[PDB]
Every structure is written in C-alpha cells, then in structure tokens.
A paper describes a structure:
The stator complexes act as ion channels, converting the electrochemical potential of ions across the membrane into the torque of the rotor complex. Two types of membrane proteins, A and B subunits, form a stator complex. In this study, we purified the chimeric MotA1/MotB1 complex from the E. coli expression system without flagellar formation, performed its structural analysis by using cryo-electron microscopy (cryo-EM) single particle analysis, and present here three structures of the chimeric MotA1/MotB1 complex in the inactive state.
In the Class 1 structure, the MotA1 ring has pseudo-pentagonal symmetry.
Author numbering:
A (entry chain G): 12 to 60
B (entry chain A), C (entry chain B), E (entry chain E), F (entry chain C), G (entry chain D): 1 to 246
D (entry chain F): 14 to 60
C-alpha cells in the first residue's frame, strides 16, 4: 500500500510520546524491590527460560 | 453473499474476539461508544469531503458487484458465438439477425447488429471498445471509495487515541487509575487499523478482482463479433475464444 | 460549497469535537500557539520551497474547482450534437456555422469551426487533443499542491513532538513544568494528522474527481465533432456519445 | 520508498514502550513529585 | 522439493532458532495461542474476504509452480526450431507437418500447425500472443494471493500488539498476571513480521521469478514460428532465438 | 536566489526556531555534535556509495536549476515562430535562414536549419525529439540524487537514535542523568526527519517542477518547427502554440 | 574499486564508528555474535527462498558491474561510426566490412555485418533491439537481488530484537543489571538497518546507475548502424549521435 501506509508516520509519533511518558515515570519512582524480584518470578514460567 | 465472504467475516470475527476472550477479556471491554463515534464518524466525514455527492449515491452498487454469486455464463455464450459464425459462413446478413433477437446478453446483441447493418471492421471495433472502456472506468470508481475509506480510517483512529490521552493525562488525579484509564484511549486505534484491514481494504480488493472477470467476458464477446465478421471457420473461432476461459 | 463538502465538514466537526466533549474535555485545551507555529509554519515552509511562486497564485483557483457545485449540462450538448449531425447531411456543412454561432460551449464552437473551415480529420483531432491535454495538466498541477502539503504536515507533527520531549526533559527536574510540554507534544501530533487527513488530502481527491468529469465531457465533444465530420447517421452518433454518459 | 523508515522506527519504539510499561510496573511512586506534575498538567488544559 | 528453497529453509531455521537456543532460551516460549489466533486467523480472514472462492483453490497450483525443479529443455527446443527452419527452406510445408507432430511442447505444435494450414502471418502472431498473455495473467493471479497475505500479516501483528498492551495496562498492580500478557505483545509482533517476511513474500517473489522464465520460453517459440513462416536462413534464426536464452 | 525559496527558508527558520524559543529553551540544547556526524556523515556516505563520482559533480548544477529565478520568455518565442510561419509561406524557405540566424534559443535555431536543408518531416521530428529526451533524462538524474538523500537521512537517524539509546539504557541503575541522556538520543531522530522533509525532499520537487516547465517550452518549438514545415496558416499556428502557454 | 564507493565506505565507517566513540563507550560493545547470526542468516534465508539457485550464482557478476571503474571509451566509438559513414558513402558497403573487421565492440561488429549482408532496415532494427532488451533484463535481475536483500534485512533486525528481549524477560534475574541486558538486544536492530541502508540498498542503486550508462552506449550504436544504412551525411550522423553523449 503506497499511500495507504501513510498512517504509520502518525503511529510512530503516538508511540514516541507514550515512550516519553512512561520513561520519565520510571525516572526516580524507585523500584519496589519486592515487586521486581517478584516480577522475575511472574514471567519465568511463561518463557520457561 | 458469496461463500468466501461469509467464511471470511466469520473467521475475522472469531480471530479478533477470540484474541481477547481467550486471554481473560470480554466483549463489553472492547465496545467503547465514543471511540466508534470518532473513528466511524471521522471516516464518513473524510469520504464525504473527498467525493462529489453523486459518487456516494453509487456505493450500494459497488457492494452488489462485490458480493453477487458467480454463475459462469461464459461457457454458454461461447457455443452461441460459434453457432452464429456457422450461420455467417452461409447466409450471414439475414440469419444471424434472428438468432440474436431475444438473446439475454445486450453487448452481444448490439455487437452483432453493427455487423448485420454492414459497418466496417475498425468502426465496429471502435464503438464496442468505447462500451468496454466505460464499464472498466465505472468499476474503478466504485473501488476508489473503499480504498479511500481504508486510508482515512486508521488515521482517524489515531486522532481518537491522541484525544483520549489529552483528556486522561490532563486529569491524572489518581496514580492507580492511570493504567485502567489509558487502556481505553487505545481502543480507538484498534477500530481504525482493524476496520481498514478486515473490511474496507478487503472489499476494495474484491471489487477489483470481479471487474477483472466481467471485462474479460466482454473482451471475449468482442473477439467473437469480429471473428464472425471475418468469416472465420468454427475451429478457428473456438481456438481463439478459449484463450479467455479458465 | 458543494453539498457533500458541507455535510462532510458538519459530520467531521460533530464526530471529533462531539466525541471529545462527550468524554468531558474542553475545546480551549486543543489550542496551543507553539504547536501551530511548528506544524502550520512548517508545512508553509516546505510547500514554498517545493513549488515556484506562480503555482501558489493558482492555489486560489484550485479550491474553486473542487467546491464549485455541479449543473450537468452534458445532456443538452449531446442533443445539440445529434441535431447538428442531421443538419450537416441535409443542408451541407455551411448551415452548421449558423447553429454553432452562439453556442455557450467554446470547445464545441471551435471544433466545429475547424470542420467548416475544411481541415482534415487527423489535424482536427490533433488540435482538439492538445486543448484537452492542456486542461488535464492544469488540474493535475492544482491537485499536486494539496497532496504535497498533506505529505509534509504529518511529518512536521513528529518534528513538533520531538521538540516537545526535549523541552520536558530539559525541564524534568521541576515536575511542575512537565505539563506545558505534554500538551505541545500531543497537540503538535493532533494538528498534523487532522489537517492532513481532513483538510488537505480530502481536497486533493475532490480536485482529481471533479476534473475527471470535466475531461470526460471534453472527450465526448471531440467524438461528437469527429463523427459530425464523417457524416455518420444520427443513430450511430447517439449510440457512440451515450458511452460517455453515466 | 521515501517511507522506508517509518515501518522500522514504529516497530523498534513499540518494543521499548512494552519494556518501560513493565519497568514502571515494577516500581513505587514519589508522593509529591506525581502531584507536582498533576496540578500543573491539569492547568495546561486551562481549566 | 527445490534446491535453493531447501537451503533457504535450512539456513532460516538454523539462523533464527540456532540464535535463540544458543543464547539459552527454549523453543517452547515461541508459541503463544492467542498470538497465533489473532495473526494467522486475521490474515486468513482478510485474504478470504478479498478474493473469490475459486482463486483460493488455485493456491495449491501456485505453490507447485514456485517449487517446480528446473528443466533445461529450452536448449533442445532451439535446436528443434532450427531443424524445422531448414526443412522449410528445403521442402514443402507438408514436411513440417510430420516433423512438428508428436512434439512434447503443445504451444510449438499448435503454432506450426497454424503455419501448415497457411494462415496469414499477422493472424498467427495474434492468436499465439493471446495464448502467451493468458499464461502471464494466470501466474500473476497466483502471485497476487501471496502478496496480499504478506501485506495483511504485519497489520494483524499491530492489532495483536495493541490488544496485548490494552491488557497489560489493565494490570499495572498485579505482577503475576503481567507476565502472560506482555508475552502476547512480544510474540504477536514476532509472528506478524516473521510469517510475512520469510513465508509469504518469498513465495510471491519465487512465483514471479519462475513465471518470467516460462514466459521467455513462450516468446522464443513465437519468434521461432514466425521466423519459420518468413523463411529466414538458419544462421539468422539461430541468432534471434539465442537472444532469449541465458 | 528565487523568491519562493527565500520566503520558504525564512518561514521555515522562524517556524522551527521561533517555536522552540517561545518555550525559552536555548538553541545550544538543540545542537549536538554526534547526531550531526551520524546523520549527515551517514547520508553523505550512503549517497557516495549509491552513485558514480561524475553524478556527484552534477549536484552543483542541480541546485542551480531549482533556485534559478524565473525569466521565461516563451511569449516572445511564440511571436517569433508565428512571424516566421508567415515569412516562410510568403517568401519561400530561403528567407527563413536569415531570420533564424542569431536567435538566442539554440533548439529553435537548429530546428529551422533542418527544415531549410529540406530534411523530411519524420526525420526532423526524430532528431528534435532526441534532444528533448536527452534534456528530460538529465533533469531526472539531478532530482534522483536529492530524492535518494532524502530517503537515507531518516534511516540514518534511527541508527544515531539506537546508538544513543544503547548508551542511556546503560543507566537504568540510576535515574541520575537518565532523562538528559534520552534527550540527546532523540536529537539524532530530529535531524534525520527534519533535514529530509524541509531540505532534501523539497528541493527534489523544485527540480521536477522547473524541469517540466522547461520541457513544455521545448515541445512548443517542436510544434512550431513542424508547423513551419507544413505551411499552416498563421491563425492555426497561433492556436496550436497557445495551447502550450499557461 | 569505484572511487565514489571507496570514499563512501571511508565516510560511512568514520561517521558511524566516529559518532559512537565520540559520545562514549567502546567498539568492543558494538560487536555481538547472535545478533549478526540472526540478521545475516535470516537475510540469506529469505533471499534463498525468494530466487532460483541460478540467480544467486549471478550475484558475483552483479558486484562487478557496480564496482567496475568506467572505461568511458564511447567518444572513440562515435568517431569510428562517423568515419565508417564516410567509408560507406564513397566506396559502398563492402568497405564497411574491412574497417570493422577487428573492432573490439561486438555489438557494433555484428550490427554492421547485418547491414553489409543487405538485411532490410526493419529487420536489422528488430534483431539489434532484441539484444539491447536482453542486456536491460539481465541488469535488472542483478539489481533485484540486492534490493530484496535490502528489504528483508531490517525486518530480520526486528526479529532479532524481539528474540533478544524474550530470552531476557524470561530470566529477569538481578534488578541492577536489567539495563545492560536489554541494551545488547538492540544491537540487532542496528545491524538490520545499518546493513540495508549502507551496504545493500546503496549497491542496488549503483547497478542501476551503471546499467543505464551502458544501455545509452548501445542505443547510440543502434542509431549509428541505422544511419549508416540510410546513407546520411557526416554532419547529420554526428548531430544525432551527440544527443546520447553528456
């Protein structure tokens, strides 16, 4: 799709802004140690290493 | 409603709904009234500005051309043209005329009439070709509405999402409600890029796929009429017209 | 203003702003002075570099072609050419001159004048076709300016967004200045996708559509003039010219 | 062809966001910092 | 099945899976039910809506053309046409009749038979060219199905990722449920890009490559039959036909 | 320098820089060494590998066409050709030779010499058309350099950005300097998209725009020289040549 | 090598590596085994599935056209054709034979040989144009392999990225070392985009650039041999052939 694919330029823009939002939230919101060490446990099963 | 379209719409519904239900979601979480209004309302607005009103009046006939059943008449008309040739080889001026009088295909009737009236080969070619060109242009003009709706829909999707974010990040009162709230704003994107790829851009493809069959039957009829005028034998007529059949 | 454009602009405003107000926003929020400068300033910049200045003076004329309303004269002109075809055979070429003396369509008036003056078929074809090609090229050049602004506006949106992020991170230490940036980020995105997919790319489609109709009327008049010069009968003229009418 | 780039950028950026959505899902929040932005961001809409 | 395809599938499996298994992952994690259902089910739905049902039955024949092993028989047919050219120089067309009969290439057999029947050279060109263009259209119709699947699959991947995120943002608090979802986001991307790029777009490419060889052999046979009818000398015939072979 | 380009660069610079400076951020924050080196150095490298050395020496000549001020004198040339069309008819062709001598347009001067030397009309058309085809190819080759440079620059940015993010992601152990690090990474994206959209891809448009205007003047003279050979009367010549003026 | 390619590779390596090293880090972090294996192995797999094996053996010959330094002898061959035109005019065609007996250019040697053997002008044009068309098709087939490698490589980078993350998120392990591990995963996307936009897609451009130069020389030789058959004067021959030179 030659001009149909035009919307992608806009998409990239939308996800860039959201990338900006979350990254800052991770900035200085120091990670709860329990939550993370727990998250490693939350995923390990799915990918099964 | 052709069987491929019916199975396609069934499979499309099962794919997207199954993709949410099988991982713990529910249909009541995918429906969002405002997102439908922004995406569908916006698509309709962009298409209406894009085309004159008389084009939009035609849109019903586009869907009828897409979803009408195949009935493969071309195998019958091939025998009719050979029969007409076999008569033109003997007493062409008069006998041909009677055979076509009540024939169900208008383009063949009028084509033969130009030969009965004794018009020269390059002029019967020219008049016939103008009628085929008109049919080809008409079917292209149907597909162009769908292809255009399919382009605008995804972008009107993103307008929906950005407007939703604009409203949430405004009033980010409760940090626990950020996740549940920002999820809804992305519903619109899914309407845009899902409607475009399972309905609009598809129906555009089918309209083009079916114009390509109707025009080829008209080209066969044209080659039949000019072969009848040349006084070709039945073997050569059949040898030639079969190139259009599959 | 054509009726489809008026209904389209009504539907677009009601869908997008009605959606936003229904989810509780405020219209004033969707205004950002800095984002207007980056996006709308940017598109003007790129379009002015892209095209010679004389093209930009044509831009006013383009909007008139798109949003002028239809009056569908073509049925009248078809009856005129059939009448004129009959007169040529019965009273000779000379009388045509009287009939075409005041016809309000210039292209037909000349085409006939070239036949009365006695010019040969391939040269009258050549001169008429040059006039049609010139009209087609003129309308294409109007459409190209809009299509091009529609290309550059979305990208100027992403320029604006990235400029937004720099300012916010540049002023992230003070989280109390975070907001003024999130606005400019989104609104620069919003102005991009909106302007391009509702004001620019839609107008381009109308110019190309409302041209294609004008070119088809000129091709009908050319086939009328050539068929009049042949001395074709009224049934052949009416049949041939009808292929151009929808 | 001039749009060769977007289909790659969009794919790459998305992957970061899925990651940082996780990271912010493995982190606590600052009490006043969140408000510092919340009051300001609200005022941006010109409330 | 075929040598370049077999080495390609071996290299693809060893590169992609050998990369992952070496890094210390398990192949088990590369399967996620909902990701498969959205991407593959959505792709199949879009293709079924887009094409008539009879086209889908051609999909078997498309694959068979793509992975057909190479036959060098064009060299033999060049020597056959040169021999027949020398028969036409020496002997009456009746001798061609025996020579052409029973050749395993039907397009050549028919072409020569049209020359033995004494049919006129521009008519022999016309009827032969109809058969070439029919074969070209048939192979194009196969390739277009695979190209369509390769276009839809990436967009269904974007739907799967957005649907995944909608789920993960729902649960920014419950760590246990987060894992199952963030996966579907990652995997639905992987099936969309990987299936499109390795399976679909290569098979489309290969059908077009193998079609181009088939059509070049038909063009050479047409130049052979016409040069036999003209009565060209064998040295010049050999020169013309050799330009088609590489 | 050309007035539309000058106004465009003024508006673009005020648009982008004025947008930033309204929010108070220093231009020194928007300037980066490594982002410039990766995006511009990468673009130069990609273009140098892409083309032979001799085409890069044409880059100077390409810019000189696009920003050349309009001084088009096509109206004057149409009067010269119509005058000769009547002198040639009255006096005989020898008088043309004197009049054509010293005319500043070389294509017109040469053409008439072909007609004075009595060369046949299809040969005159052939030689003149070879010269127009050469000029059309030359201007296309200029535009292709910038068009290419505008497709490499954004992708070079994704390289600069990824190298930045590779670094920043090293600092996920501390939110210290995490932000200011991400800001710099995205600067490379900004130079890629901004240069492609506002400089490289626009200049391509101008080369193609101004090329098309020049070729239209040359096609007018080809109709001028051929109408002088045919001996068409002054009113008919004036009609034909006016179709080329806009 | 071609001087522009050498300077391009110097500039590209200095831009990418110099940019990276200037902002910090070490080159020892930019080389990663599994990322190279997935991107290059995956590209090779997709290309091998895409083409017959015989096309891939042409890939060596493709690079030679791209990086072959120009011999630019065409000016010498223009003087040969002008000399031969004068030889043919005085002596008759027999003398042409002796002059071209040792000419190093095969296409000219044959073209002339067909004219001295007294073949008809439409026949000599037809046979020579078949040879030019064959060379155009051959160079297109070389370019297409590199282009298609250039469109698979970025997407193999996305696959490599996702598989990198998937292994990580699996074994999340220590919370201080998350950053370095995800950072490496993005090395892959770098190889995908860098290879396609600096090595593969550029080489396609050179093969098409240098192909076009070669085809212009063959078209000049064709107009030369047709002009010597027609018996044009040296001034007219020189003028025609000069249109092909820049």
């Amino acid at each position: 799709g030659s001009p149909h694919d035009r919307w992608m330029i806009t998409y990239a823009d939308l996800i860039t802004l959201l990338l900006i939002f979350f990254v800052m939230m991770y900035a200085m919101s120091r990670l709860d140690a329990s939550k993370y060490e727990e998250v490693t446990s939350s995923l390990q099963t799915t990918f099964q290493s | 409603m052709d069987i491929a379209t019916l199975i396609g719409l069934i499979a499309g519904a099962v794919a997207i709904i199954g993709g949410f239900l099988w991982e713990g979601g529910q249909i009541t979480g995918l429906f969002q009234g405002t997102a439908a209004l922004i995406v569908f309302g916006g698509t309709i607005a962009a298409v209406l500005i894009s085309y004159p009103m008389h084009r939009i009046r035609t849109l019903p006939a586009g869907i009828k051309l897409a979803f009408k059943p195949n009935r493969s008449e071309v195998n019958e008309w091939l025998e009719d043209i050979v029969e007409m040739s076999m008569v033109a080889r003997r007493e062409g001026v008069l006998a041909l005329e009677q055979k076509v009088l009540d024939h169900p295909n208008i383009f063949l009737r009028e084509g033969i009439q130009l030969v009965v009236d004794g018009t020269d080969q390059p002029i019967v070619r020219q008049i016939m070709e103008l009628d085929i060109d008109a049919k080809e242009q008409e079917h292209d003009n149907y597909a162009k509405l769908f292809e255009s709706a399919g382009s605008y829909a995804p972008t009107m999707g993103i307008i929906g999402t950005v407007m939703g974010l604009i409203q949430v990040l405004g009033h980010l009162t409760d940090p626990s409600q950020l996740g549940p709230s920002i999820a809804v704003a992305f519903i619109a994107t899914l309407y845009g890029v899902a409607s475009a790829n399972l309905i609009f851009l598809p129906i555009a493809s089918k309209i083009r796929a079916k114009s390509a069959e109707e025009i080829l039957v008209m080209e066969m009829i044209l080659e039949g009429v000019l072969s009848v005028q040349n006084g070709d034998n039945a073997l050569l007529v059949r040898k030639k017209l079969n190139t259009y059949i599959t």
